[PDB]
Design a protein around this ligand. Structure first.
Ligand code: CLA
Ligand code: CLA
Ligand code: CLA
Ligand code: CLA
Ligand code: CLA
Ligand SMILES: CCCCCCCCCCCCCCCCCC(=O)OC[C@H](CO[C@@H]1O[C@H](CO)[C@H](O)[C@H](O)[C@H]1O)OC(=O)CCCCCCCCCCCCCCCCC
Ligand code: KC2
Ligand code: KC2
Ligand SMILES: CC1=C(C#C/C(C)=C/C=C/C(C)=C/C=C/C=C(C)/C=C/C=C(\C)C#CC2=C(C)C[C@@H](O)CC2(C)C)C(C)(C)C[C@H](O)C1
Ligand SMILES: CC1=C(C#C/C(C)=C/C=C/C(C)=C/C=C/C=C(C)/C=C/C=C(C)/C=C/C2=C(C)CCCC2(C)C)C(C)(C)C[C@H](O)C1
Ligand SMILES: CC1=CCCC(C)(C)[C@H]1/C=C/C(C)=C/C=C/C(C)=C/C=C/C=C(C)/C=C/C=C(C)/C=C/C1=C(C)CCCC1(C)C
Ligand SMILES: CC1=CCCC(C)(C)[C@H]1/C=C/C(C)=C/C=C/C(C)=C/C=C/C=C(C)/C=C/C=C(C)/C=C/C1=C(C)CCCC1(C)C
Lengths: 35, 49, 187, 185, 175, 67, 177
């Protein structure tokens, strides 16, 4: 049960961190009208 | 359940991934960030990547 | 030193420390570990004079506290009195006032780094014992630094002999005993 | 630093090991140089550190030998009460608990901090020679020729005292007797 | 003249023009802030504290018919009705916005370059003489500097011992 | 003291920013904060640029794998 | 053309006198395949951690904060006694400085783009090394102590784990087997 808990925490944190630091990586510039 | 632990963290083990995985992601993001032109701008958004 | 060569007069087998030219009072060329080569001699002399000026008051305070305590404070030895007064809030008053003084002490230190004030040289001579006379000031400064060093060592002694013997300094001199019950103790 | 007896002792033309020749570090200037270094410690380690170690060992071991003898002939009053009858290495363990050996370690370490500084300073060209701590209060080393000789005596007696102290300690391990008692057996 | 802290150099901006200037600013607030704003704050604090000191003295022995007296003057703030305190606050706001010309910011208070503390309040003509004004400017600032400390002490040892300042002096006891 | 506030009810120990130990830690915090501005400048003015401050080692420097 | 530390092996091409810790020892030859600046920075950083870690093993083991969960000598078993709360706020303190010293540049493709030499985070409060000779001897001293302290924390830690005894205690007790 705890093993499943820590695995799910690992997965959730991984994807949430990817989302967080991906939208923080100057996402507004990723448009076809840049330059 | 219903115990009131902060972020559901009842075991101290749960914190190791919760703090480290953002830190590895932060380290990877810092290589991107340090490469950017971090001076100010007067625009609605930054067009420099 | 038995062989020819230039060496510190303090330690004949070690060189004269480089930044200890000799201008400073009490400069016996004693810096084996070379702090002066790593730090300002100005800032280090400030620290020395501050430690000495605190420790001389500390030594005389221990002696007087053993001899006499005020009618309103209890009669406890100098070391165990610390907790009695920290609670009484007295130490949280000495600390406040000394911190208030040391704000300007630190500003003066930063002005010593800029070479505007000699280390430890406040303009404190209200009775004017040696302000007019310069050679008297130099002699008194040498005596000040000697007393500073001696009082630091004496304070360290008088506290550790208490930590072992559990006696005041006057009590120890009147009733001197060896530590650990050695008049009857084996191994 | 002219060498006393250069030609008969401590000098060129006196090479101890006839077949072998000495390392290039062992020149004719050093004191007590009989051209003896078969294992070749000198080429690896600087000669100043090596002579510092030799003189420190010799000076420590002369005191150690005379201590192990004098402790048998006589003892300071009161040691027999605190310390029971206790010879060379048992007395170490007893005195460690007594706390005397802590004081010896503290103060000899305090002196050896400045010994470390002196070794450092000599090894960076301070001009100090090995083992020269400027200690000659009686001015008996003032004359240069007598100083020359006394240096080789210091080295040789240090070596003899080193071997002697090894002897006394291992004889104690064998018989559990001191030097004076061991010799009369 | 003599320097307040003789082991620290005189501050550069703190020239001897304002009354009561003995070259005292070790931490260096003059360098990083307008000395006119600081002088105005000094005089305002001194004036409110002089008035408050006299308030502590008079309130201990006097109480108007409509109000009731507390154990100490500091207690008079709490027995008094709450609405009147807000009336006082808004009256002081009107006085401090009208008297300052409705210029209540450091960037605009001295647009007209008036002297700090010169709110144009001078009924009875005191200080009309050029020489008397110079001495009275010094008297004001030194009395205000005294009264800030005095108000602080009287407040804190009226709260610590629930006793007015005069009654404390007539019946002093250790804390 | 009777009317001192921010104090405990039964313990009698002052608590918070008005405690004796918080004052002590506050002095040491300001010490740690003032250490770098003070001793860094002490280092800047004097420093070990004496042209004699040099590390010394027992082994011969011909082959120490020296940098 | 033969390594000094490994006489039998030929010298690694990358390894060189210029490094300040070179003795020709890279038998694997990692140097050939990674940024040697990155490798030196990693070596000095691991060693700077371990140099403090061994002394910690030792000081924590004798003295300790009088705070309630701070007093547990066996360091191995101490990490858990002090709360992770504390261990985390410290981990976060080291994070701040990681990014402070490295100045944001903390990836292999970005760390040294600013010209920072490896293993320097611009720290030199004392023991100044403006003297290249002094820098040259001090860097070898630092590298040797880094390498030694690695072995150290390793032993102390694995050993504290083996016998539940802190460093000084274990050897004195030296319960063997
Ligand atoms: C390092 C300095 C130092 C420190 C930390 C303390 C700390 C203490 N002293 Mg003091 N004491 C000191 C120096 C010091 N003393 C000196 C130099 C004297 C001799 C005059 C005394 C004489 C003395 C007595 C007689 C008593 C204490 C007591 C105390 C306690 C209560 C505070 C008090 O009333 O102080 C009083 C401090 C003074 C009167 C000294 C004032 C002078 C200062 C240091 C400025 C120097 C002169 C100035 C530059 C001109 C406290 C533990 C009381 C105690 O032990 O209660 C249990 C107590 O009864 N002290
Ligand atoms: C670490 C060594 C040591 C120890 C444990 C003791 C212990 C003791 N000494 Mg001491 N003593 C020592 C060294 C030591 N002494 C030294 C170096 C001297 C200076 C010569 C003295 C001089 C001395 C005297 C003069 C006397 C003692 C006496 C005593 C005993 C009382 C006490 C048990 C007394 C005693 O019992 O004598 C029989 C006594 O009269 N001691
Ligand atoms: C406890 C403190 C203390 C300290 C700091 C030192 C320091 C020193 N000792 Mg030691 N030493 C001490 C106590 C101490 N000693 C005592 C009490 C004795 C017994 C008399 C000795 C006996 C002694 C001898 C016989 C020698 C040293 C040497 C040295 C030096 C070499 C250190 C080294 O390379 O270690 C490296 C080891 C690391 C683990 C250094 C000056 C040697 C020296 O001077 O070499 C040139 C040397 O020959 N010491
Ligand atoms: C708290 C946050 C924090 C942050 C922001 C950093 C940041 C960094 N650390 Mg780390 N570090 C931290 C905590 C942190 N550290 C702590 C608490 C310690 C213990 C004292 C260390 C000890 C440490 C060392 C000793 C090293 C780093 C390295 C690095 C760099 C790259 C790490 C990487 O990409 O790992 C991604 C890869 C892994 C996590 C692999 C881990 C498993 C290995 C391969 C076994 C980077 C500057 C490395 C560096 O500077 O490279 C030259 C390096 O050598 N760090
Ligand atoms: C410096 C490195 C090192 C270390 C840390 C150890 C550690 C150990 N060795 Mg040793 N060992 C070493 C080098 C080392 N060895 C070398 C170079 C060899 C030859 C290749 C051996 C061969 C060896 C044998 C044959 C045995 C040990 C054993 C031991 C144990 C000794 C502890 C004890 O009981 O007291 C321990 C696991 C003993 C063991 O495993 O006991 C359970 C044992 O029997 N060691
Ligand atoms: C949004 C508005 C809805 C309000 C949500 C409440 C917010 C409270 C957040 C704390 C949640 C909490 O403590 O977890 C606690 C709970 C789970 O915690 C539970 O705790 C219990 C005892 O407390 C037990 O321990 C259970 O085992 C454990 O599951 O969280 C969850 O339900 C999972 C979180 C899912 C998060 C989805 C990610 C959202 C996607 C993007 C995230 C935004 C990122 C922004 C980055 C900046
Ligand atoms: C200097 C400051 C100041 C000014 C400039 C000012 C001006 C005016 C004006 C002019 C426009 C009017 C018309 C007005 C009227 C009333 N004032 Mg008032 N007042 C000031 C101060 C106080 C204080 C301290 C108190 C107070 C009060 C009352 C009451 C009582 C009502 C009641 O019966 O409850 C009434 C009717 C008392 C109070 O509200 O008591 C509950 C009270 O304590 N005022 N006040
Ligand atoms: C050098 C590194 C370092 C820094 C820079 C740093 C800074 C600050 C600051 C500054 C902004 C604050 C305000 C703060 C506060 C707290 N620190 Mg912290 N701290 C560091 C180190 C440790 C260690 C080793 C421990 C620790 C702890 C706590 C607790 C305990 C709360 C509790 O548990 O009730 C609190 C409230 C202990 C802990 O959490 O465990 C008991 C603990 O062991 N800290 N700490
Ligand atoms: C950098 C710097 C500065 C500085 C500084 C400072 C504070 C530097 C501090 C450096 C430190 C603390 C270094 C520690 C090194 C320790 C080592 C090598 C340990 C080895 C242990 C071994 C091999 C072992 C072992 C053992 C094991 C495993 C098993 C046990 O049973 C036995 C045993 C215990 C023997 C300053 C401030 C001057 C400023 C300057 O501008 C820059
Ligand atoms: C105190 C204490 C302890 C202890 C202890 C101590 C301190 C023990 C040991 C002490 C000393 C001084 C040992 C000396 C050994 C000398 C030897 C083997 C000489 C060899 C000579 C040779 C090969 C000669 C060579 C030669 C010579 C000269 C002449 C011919 C040529 C040549 C071949 C070159 C413990 C451990 C019991 C623990 C206790 O709790 C506390
Ligand atoms: C309590 C209460 C009751 C009713 C109303 C309300 C609820 C608002 C509330 C009001 C609270 C108010 C008005 C609080 C005001 C606080 C005051 C005036 C505090 C004053 C603190 C003063 C202090 C420290 C002074 C200490 C000064 C020192 C050492 C100066 C040092 C020195 C200097 C600068 C130069 C010469 C040498 C010397 C003397 C060493
Ligand atoms: C496990 C645990 C317990 C408590 C804390 C926590 C939960 C966090 C967790 C922490 C664990 C940590 C910090 C583990 C760290 C591991 C460490 C420091 C391991 C070190 C291992 C070192 C080893 C093998 C060294 C062996 C070296 C050798 C042969 C070298 C050989 C040699 C070489 C290479 C060249 C010259 C010749 C010579 C000397 C023979």
């Amino acid at each position: 049960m705890f093993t499943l808990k820590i695995v799910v925490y690992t997965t959730v944190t991984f994807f949430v961190s990817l989302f967080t630091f991906g939208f923080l990586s100057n996402d507004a510039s990723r448009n076809p009208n840049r330059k | 359940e219903g115990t009131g632990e902060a972020l559901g963290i009842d075991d101290t083990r749960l914190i190791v991934p919760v703090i480290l995985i953002p830190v590895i992601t932060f380290i990877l993001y810092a290589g991107f960030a340090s490469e950017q032109d971090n001076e100010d701008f007067f625009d609605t958004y930054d067009q420099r990547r | 030193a038995v062989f020819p060569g230039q060496f510190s007069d303090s330690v004949p087998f070690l060189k004269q420390p480089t930044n200890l030219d000799g201008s400073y009072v009490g400069d016996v060329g004693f810096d084996p570990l070379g702090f002066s080569d790593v730090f300002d001699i100005r800032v280090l002399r400030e620290a020395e004079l501050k430690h000495g000026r605190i420790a001389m008051l500390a030594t005389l305070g221990m002696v007087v506290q053993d001899a006499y305590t005020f009618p309103f404070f209890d009669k406890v030895l100098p070391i165990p009195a610390h907790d009695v007064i920290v609670k009484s809030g007295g130490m949280s008053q000495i600390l406040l006032w000394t911190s208030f003084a040391e704000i300007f002490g630190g500003i003066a230190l930063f002005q010593t780094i800029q070479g505007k004030r000699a280390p430890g040289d406040y303009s404190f001579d209200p009775l004017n014992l040696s302000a007019n006379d310069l050679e008297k000031r130099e002699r008194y400064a040498l005596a000040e630094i000697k007393h500073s060093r001696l009082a630091m060592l004496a304070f360290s002694g008088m506290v550790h002999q208490y930590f072992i013997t559990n006696q005041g300094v006057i009590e120890q001199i009147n009733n001197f005993r060896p530590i650990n019950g050695f008049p009857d103790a084996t191994f | 630093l002219p060498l006393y007896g250069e030609g008969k002792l401590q000098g060129p033309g006196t090479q101890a090991i006839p077949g072998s020749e000495p390392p290039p570090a062992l020149d004719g200037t050093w004191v007590g140089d009989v051209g003896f270094d078969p294992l070749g410690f000198s080429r690896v380690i600087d000669m100043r550190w090596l002579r510092e170690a030799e003189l420190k060992h010799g000076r420590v071991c002369m005191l150690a030998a005379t201590g192990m003898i004098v402790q048998d002939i006589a003892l300071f009053p009161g040691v027999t009460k605190t310390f029971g009858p206790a010879k060379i290495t048992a007395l170490h363990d007893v005195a460690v608990k007594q706390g005397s050996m802590q004081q010896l370690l503290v103060w000899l370490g305090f002196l050896e901090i400045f010994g470390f500084v002196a070794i450092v300073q000599m090894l960076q060209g301070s001009g100090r020679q090995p083992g020269d701590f400027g200690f000659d209060p009686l001015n008996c080393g003032a004359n240069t020729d007598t100083l020359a000789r006394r240096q080789l005596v210091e080295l040789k007696n240090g070596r003899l005292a080193m071997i002697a102290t090894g002897g006394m300690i291992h004889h104690f391990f064998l018989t559990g007797k001191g030097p004076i008692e061991f010799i009369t057996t | 003249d003599d320097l307040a802290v003789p082991f620290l150099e005189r501050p550069p901006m703190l020239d001897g023009s304002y009354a009561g200037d003995i070259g005292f600013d070790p931490v260096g607030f003059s360098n990083y802030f307008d000395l006119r704003w600081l002088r105005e704050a000094e005089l305002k604090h001194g004036r409110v504290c002089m008035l408050g000191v006299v308030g502590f003295l008079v309130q201990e022995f006097v109480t108007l018919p409509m109000f009731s007296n507390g154990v100490t003057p500091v207690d008079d703030f709490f027995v008094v009705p709450a609405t009147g305190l807000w009336q006082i606050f808004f009256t002081i706001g009107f006085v401090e916005a009208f008297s300052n010309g409705f210029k209540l910011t450091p960037s605009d208070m001295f647009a007209d370059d008036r002297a700090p503390g010169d709110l144009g309040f001078d009924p009875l003509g005191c200080g009309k003489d050029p020489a008397a004004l110079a001495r009275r400017q010094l008297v004001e600032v030194k009395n205000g500097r005294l009264a800030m400390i005095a108000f602080g002490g009287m407040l804190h040892q009226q709260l610590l011992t629930k006793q007015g300042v005069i009654e404390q002096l007539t019946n002093f006891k250790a804390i | 003291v009777p009317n001192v506030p921010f104090v405990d009810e039964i313990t009698g120990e002052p608590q918070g920013l008005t405690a004796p130990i918080v004052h002590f830690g506050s002095v040491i915090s300001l010490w740690l904060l003032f250490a770098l501005p003070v001793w860094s400048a002490a280092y800047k003015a004097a420093g070990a640029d004496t042209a004699e401050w040099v590390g010394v080692s027992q082994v011969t420097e011909d082959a120490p794998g020296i940098g | 053309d033969r390594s000094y530390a490994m006489p039998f092996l030929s010298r690694p091409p990358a390894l060189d006198g210029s490094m300040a810790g070179d003795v020709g020892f890279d038998p694997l030859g990692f140097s050939n395949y990674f940024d040697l600046k990155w490798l030196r920075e990693a070596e000095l950083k691991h060693g700077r951690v371990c140099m403090l870690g061994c002394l910690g093993f030792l000081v924590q083991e004798q003295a300790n904060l009088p705070l309630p969960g701070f007093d547990n000598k066996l360091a191995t078993e101490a990490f858990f006694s002090v709360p992770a709360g504390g261990l985390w706020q410290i981990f976060f303190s080291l994070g701040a400085i990681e990014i402070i010293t490295n100045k944001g540049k903390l990836t292999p493709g970005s760390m040294f783009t600013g010209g920072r030499a490896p293993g320097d985070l611009d720290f030199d409060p004392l023991n100044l090394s403006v003297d290249e000779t002094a820098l040259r001897r001090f860097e070898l001293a630092e590298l040797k102590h880094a390498r030694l302290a690695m072995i150290g924390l390793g032993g102390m830690l694995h050993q504290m784990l083996l016998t539940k005894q802190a460093p000084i205690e274990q050897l004195t007790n030296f319960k063997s087997l």
